[PDB]
Structures are given as C-alpha cells and as structure tokens.
Amino acid sequence: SMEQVAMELRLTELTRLLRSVLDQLQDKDPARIFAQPVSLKEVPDYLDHIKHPMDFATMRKRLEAQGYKNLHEFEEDFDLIIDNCMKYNARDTVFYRAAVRLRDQGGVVLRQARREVDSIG
Template sequence: SSLNDMPLRSILQIITDFLQRDDPDELFAQPINLDVVEKYHEIIKQPMDFGTIRAKIHEGLYTNLEQFKLLHTFPHDQTNISFYFNDVQRDVFLMFSNAMNVNPATSKYHQVV
C-alpha cells in the first residue's frame, strides 16, 4: 500500500507523530493548564497543542493536503515522500508562536521551537 492509497486521517496522524518526536518533554502535548499560566488567554487568543491537533484530525476537521509541503525520506527504503497540507501547518505554527509569545526567550519552550 502506498502513501497515495492511505486515508487523509492516517497521513495526518503520521505527520503529527513525526512533528511531535521533537517534543520529548511533551511541552506541547496538551492544552495549557490555566491554573499554572496566569493571564494566558489575555496574551494568546487562539491556543493550540498537539492534543487539539490530534482531536481535529480524529474529527475530520482537516480536509486536504494542499499548499504546505514537507519532504521526508524514509530511512528503511530511501523513499522520498512529499506531504502537502495547510490547516495542520497553520495549527503547528500557531502552537509554536503561542509558546514563544508567552514564555521568555530563555525558557525551554524556545529551545524546542
């Protein structure tokens, strides 16, 4: 079975798994705990995290793979795969941007991004 035969939801889950590997401390795994981060919603108008992205994938809220390209080479057979998506890209960049806007430049959140 090739990537072209896979359902969109499966492709997006693979992409999210790939991106989340760079977050071993799970800083972006779930929504921010508002009891821990004061005034978060005053600074961040549209929160985002990998858990929310996964929920949106599960609910079918991402509908296409157009506009954004991610090239990945699979090590086991050196197959080059290009992924195109836009809504997932927007949410991933939103998640990282939110973290950078709310945390000091010296924080571990800036190191992940």
C-alpha cells in the first residue's frame, strides 16, 4: 500500500538521523571503551553481573537493519551502555569515569535530537 511505503520512508529518515546521532555519541568516547561488546573470553563472569550487555557496534548493527522504531528505543540502548558500565566498574576506574563523561556529553546531543525527531516528525 501507499500507507506502508510512507511509514517506511519515515523509518528510513529516522534511521538517517539516528546514524548521525550515533556518530556524534561515539565521538564522545575517543578511547573506544564502548566500541565493542565486553569479551566473555576476557571477563568470563560478565553475564552473572550484567543481564543486558550493550555497546556501540551492537547498536550500529541494529540501526542498519532499521531496528529502532523511535528515539526512545535508541536511548534505552545508549543508557544500557552507560548504566552497565557504572554498575560493573567501580567509581575510581578509567571505565566508570569514561561512562560519566559519555553520559554528560551525550545528554547535550540527545536534548536536540529529541527536538529534531519531534520537529521533523
């Protein structure tokens, strides 16, 4: 139907905006701490601690299958990256501190993305 096509054009445009948002978020992680999944070879107990792992590569695979229906879903996954790290790692670590910085800096980007998703519809 033409209605289905139009919904698909909206999904595609959301996907384009989310890709730019994701690049901007990942620049706030110049150390690449959050680039890839936590390795189960190197942290074999990780899944006893963290139930829903997340990382930027995993987000990127989802995005390119147009798997985010809205910004809420995308923010949930970004929040998991930060929140998993701040539970698994202690306050006095390079990992926890990188999370806090990504959160603070990413909040700016997300504040305007929420306005752009609303605005462009």
